[PDB]
Amino acid sequence: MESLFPNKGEIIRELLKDPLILKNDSKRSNGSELELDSSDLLQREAILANELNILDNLKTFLNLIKEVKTNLNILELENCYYSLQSLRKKMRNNAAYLKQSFNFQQSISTYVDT
């Protein structure tokens, strides 16, 4: 009569053209690339993860610099001392500083000296 219907496969395919239902056929043929795509994406993910880690560990530096600068702007002059003290101590001891390039530390030194 009129009440009989196809399988799961054909209905899924119709749903797949149907913009309401999308599968992921974009990487069905990448069997020998999906693994190492995920590998290099997770490697760049750990790289970017530790990179952002270093970057907010140095946002600490930017923060303390904006802090000391504001303190100048408010003429604290005492927590200014403690704060440049802390900043120097960190620059010396903050491993993040110890892993930065030579020129960045150069500029940091120059700014903190100024």
Partner 1 sequence: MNGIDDLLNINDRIKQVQNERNELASKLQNLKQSLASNDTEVALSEVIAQDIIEVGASVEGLEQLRAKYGDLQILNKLEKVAVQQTQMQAGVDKLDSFERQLDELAEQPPDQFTLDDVKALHSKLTSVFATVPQINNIDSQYAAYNKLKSK
Stretch that binds partner 1, among 20-28, 73-81, 85-93 (CB under 8 A): 20-28
Please tell me whether residue 73 binds partner 1 under the rule CB under 8 A.
Answer: no
How many whole angstroms separate alpha carbon 73 and alpha carbon 68? 8
**23 interacts with partner 1 by CB under 8 A:** yes
Q: What's the min distance (Å) between Cβ of 82 and partner 1? A: 20
Residues 6+ apart with CB under 8 A from 106: none
CB of 24 to partner 1, least distance (A): 4
Which is closer to partner 1, CB of 78 or CB of 92? 92
DSSP 6: -
Q: How far apart are CA 80 and CA 69, in angstroms?
A: 9
- Alpha helix (H) residue ranges in 1-101: 8-17, 31-74, 79-93, 95-99
11 contributes a contact to partner 1 by CB under 8 A:
yes
Decide: helix, strand or coil at residue 99: helix
To 5 degrees, how large is the angle CA 38–CA 8–CA 21?
A: 55
Which residues of this chain interact with partner 1, rule CB under 8 A? 1-6, 8, 11-12, 14-15, 18, 20-21, 23-28, 30-31, 34, 37-38, 41-42, 44-45, 48-49, 51-52, 55-56, 58-59, 61-62, 65, 100-101, 103-104, 107-108, 110-111
